[PDB]
């Protein structure tokens, strides 16, 4: 389900897309980002909440 | 600080099982070891290469399975079994960890990430006849 | 696997005479190409990691170019002390070929 993709404003959440696959995940693991940037270029990133 | 040690080292009768190398004031497990066979007149290389993990064990082509690693990291000792062995076979046998050169040149960025220190000062085993 | 075999088995160099030795790979299989110089009764120690940037601890004098499978490695104001049997070894993941160098040794010139 995506926000943007319907209500960007009011944060209500459509679904848009469905995976063909039956079985669903029984766990979720986050996958840790690192941006490849220099000093100059490094900059504040906003937070993802769970 | 690091000390690398080699220990079991001894002359032995050819077709013979010998059992190896130690790692003291370091931390076995974020390390892989890696044992090299230096022979006189010949360039040193690699006939067992274990990572870090220990469950993946690398044999050089030259050894058809003449060399066995086993590693225990909470022991910071890895244990290498010595099987069929030659007097061509007879050579000193160095233990380091290798490391390699890995980033990402978002501008022309490069990290060494080596680390060649504490080199094993090696252990010599002989055939007598 | 690589066969390798450095051009000279020994090298003669006279004290403060610019020197080269060659040692030629099967293909170079690989960007990282390692050169190390061996003291007898002491722990290896490698000259050069990729060829294109110098190891810690190493004369700036020593220098690591590449031509082709051939890789040379300059030696300047040689000196006996600084003079040792050179194993090139080609650098990569997919090692187990374990490939050596012959050993090229260098004698002082009289």
């Known amino acids: 389900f995506s926000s943007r993709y319907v209500d960007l404003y009011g944060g209500n959440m459509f679904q848009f897309a469905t995976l063909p696959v039956y079985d669903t995940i029984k766990y979720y693991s986050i996958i840790p980002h690192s941006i490849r940037s220099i000093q100059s270029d490094r900059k504040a990133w906003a937070a993802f909440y769970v | 600080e690091v000390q690398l040690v080699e220990s079991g080292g001894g002359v032995v009768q050819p077709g013979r099982s010998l059992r190896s190398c130690a790692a003291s004031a370091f931390t076995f497990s974020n390390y892989g070891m890696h044992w090299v066979r230096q022979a006189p007149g010949k360039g040193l290389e690699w006939v067992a290469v274990?990572?870090?993990?220990?469950?993946?064990?690398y044999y050089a082509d030259s050894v058809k399975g003449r060399f066995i690693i086993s590693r225990d990291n909470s022991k910071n000792t890895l244990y290498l079994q010595m099987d069929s062995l030659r007097p061509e076979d007879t050579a000193v046998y160095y233990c380091?960890?290798?490391?390699?050169?890995?980033?990402?040149?978002?501008?022309?960025?490069?990290?060494?990430?080596?680390?060649?220190?504490?080199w094993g000062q090696g252990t010599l085993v002989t055939v007598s006849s | 696997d690589i066969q390798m075999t450095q051009t000279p088995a020994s090298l003669s160099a006279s004290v403060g005479d610019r020197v080269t030795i060659t040692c030629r790979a099967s293909?170079?299989?690989?960007?990282?190409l390692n050169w190390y110089q061996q003291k007898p009764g002491k722990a290896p120690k490698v000259l050069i990691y990729?060829?294109?940037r110098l190891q810690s601890g190493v004369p700036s004098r020593f220098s690591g170019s590449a031509s082709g499978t051939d890789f040379t490695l300059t030696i300047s104001s040689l000196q006996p002390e600084d003079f040792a049997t050179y194993y090139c070894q080609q650098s990569c993941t997919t090692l187990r070929c374990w490939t050596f160098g012959q050993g090229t040794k260098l004698e002082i010139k009289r």
């Open positions: 293909q170079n299989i690989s960007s990282y």
């Open positions: 380091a960890r290798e490391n390699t050169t890995y980033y990402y040149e978002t501008s022309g960025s490069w990290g060494a990430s080596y680390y060649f220190d504490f």
């Open positions: 990729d060829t294109s």
């Open positions: 274990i990572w870090s993990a220990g469950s993946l064990k």
